[PDB]
């Protein structure tokens, strides 16, 4: 292992780039309609390689007259995962999520309504490309901890798009909002008369959705109902081809956190357990980049669950892991290239990785920087090139 070598470095440069993109769930005040509006980017792996991007926009009004509450800016963090029940034999969905509110750093009437476990109930219609489908959907809700469970069927036969470009259609009103934050929780301050959610959906070199939602309580059931129309798909496409993963790859071995600390070291430099904006600074100018505090805050905003403004390493840990499960675009694995490839050629030379590991504090002699690049060195012309460069990032 000098694989140990490049494993701690790019997971490293990975971190970064995470730390420099949006991938959370933005929410704004949108006074003109009483209520809020939204945008994120979702990560939809392909089966086999590569990803497709997802980008949302997304706006929410009250049904009722009712006073809400408009929220500062702030964003929510959501982990799902997808299963199967061995007993079904209909085309379903099990899913899980987790939802919590973060991106402000250190009481509605309607919020009343989840303190306990709410009964939850979905329907769907949608029509992608005049293939029309119907999804219903039941579970329950826990909005204590920001807990959803439930079960999808597609009613109609065989579901035409695969099922994951649908999790994010198929109730923000279960996201647990922090002590601090309960002024900016609108989703729950609009219940029980409750809210209509729209969004366009734009699948990148493919169609989009356009959805349109009631999210309400019926009795003692909060209830979504939703149609969807879909324009503008490939037939040989991801979706309408059904290229994309089902399943929440989410491993973690013990051995994937140990390479995930020695990357979190190399930030962490005091050995506090934490990262400063300091410390990240610290590193970005090393590796050739020229940060602002401001945007130092910023990007550890993006990840600081707790809103203490440094990022713990179990906050760098949950990063890390949601950065290995879903794929990065070929824009972003070229970035991370470029971090190395200081001249721009296509490939890392023995003395560029030379400067970049003396600018990180790596003592390597000239001949580890050697075993380095020969460790990744497929065509053994004496460089890293693009294509033996994302092969060592996997
Ligand atoms: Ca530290
Ligand atoms: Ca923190
Ligand atoms: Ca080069
Ligand atoms: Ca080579």
């Known amino acids: 292992s000098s694989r140990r070598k490049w494993n701690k470095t790019g997971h490293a440069v990975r971190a970064i780039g995470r730390l420099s993109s949006l991938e959370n769930v933005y929410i704004m005040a949108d006074k003109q309609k009483n209520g809020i509006k939204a945008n994120f980017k979702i990560r939809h792996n392909i089966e086999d390689g590569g990803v497709q991007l997802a980008y949302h926009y997304q706006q929410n009004t009250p049904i009722g007259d009712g006073p809400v ?9 959501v982990q799902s995962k997808l299963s199967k029940d061995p ?16 991106g402000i750093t250190l009481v509605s009437k309607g919020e009343e309504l989840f303190t306990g476990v709410v009964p939850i109930l979905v329907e769907l219609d949608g029509d992608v490309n005049g293939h029309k489908f119907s999804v219903s959907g039941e579970g329950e809700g826990d909005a204590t901890y920001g807990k959803l469970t439930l079960k999808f069927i597609c009613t109609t036969g065989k579901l035409p798009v695969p099922w994951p470009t649908l999790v994010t259609t198929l109730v923000q009103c279960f996201s647990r909002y922090p002590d601090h934050m309960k002024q900016h929780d609108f989703f729950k301050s609009a219940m029980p008369e409750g809210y209509i959610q729209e969004r366009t959906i ?42 994309l993963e089902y399943n929440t790859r989410d491993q973690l071995t013990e051995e994937q956190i140990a390479e995930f600390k020695e990357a979190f070291s190399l930030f962490d430099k005091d050995g506090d357990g934490t990262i400063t904006t300091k410390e990240l600074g610290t590193v970005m100018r090393s590796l050739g980049q020229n940060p602002t505090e401001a945007e130092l805050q910023d990007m550890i905003n993006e990840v600081d ?20 499960k879903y794929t990065d675009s070929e824009e972003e694995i070229r970035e991370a290239f470029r971090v190395f490839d200081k001249d721009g050629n296509g ?30 060195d497929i065509d053994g012309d004496g460089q890293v090139n693009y294509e033996e460069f994302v092969q060592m990032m996997t």
Do not use: C, Q
């Open 69 to 77: 509450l408009l929220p500062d800016n702030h964003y929510l963090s």
């Open 305 to 324: 669950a707790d809103g203490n403004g440094t990022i713990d390493f179990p906050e760098f840990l949950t990063m890390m892991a949601r950065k290995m």
């Open 202 to 243: 734009f699948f990148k070199d493919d169609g989009n959705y356009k959805t349109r939602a009631e999210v309400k309580f019926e009795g003692d059931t909060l209830v979504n109902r939703i149609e969807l129309k879909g324009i503008d798909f490939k037939e040989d496409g991801n979706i309408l081809g059904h290229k």
């Open 347 to 376: 490939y890392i030379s023995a003395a560029e990785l030379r400067h970049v590991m003396t600018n990180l504090g790596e003592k390597l002699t000239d001949e580890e920087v050697d075993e380095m690049i020969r460790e990744a």
């Open 87 to 102: 007993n079904e034999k209909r085309d379903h969905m099990v899913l899980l999520e987790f939802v919590t509110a973060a």
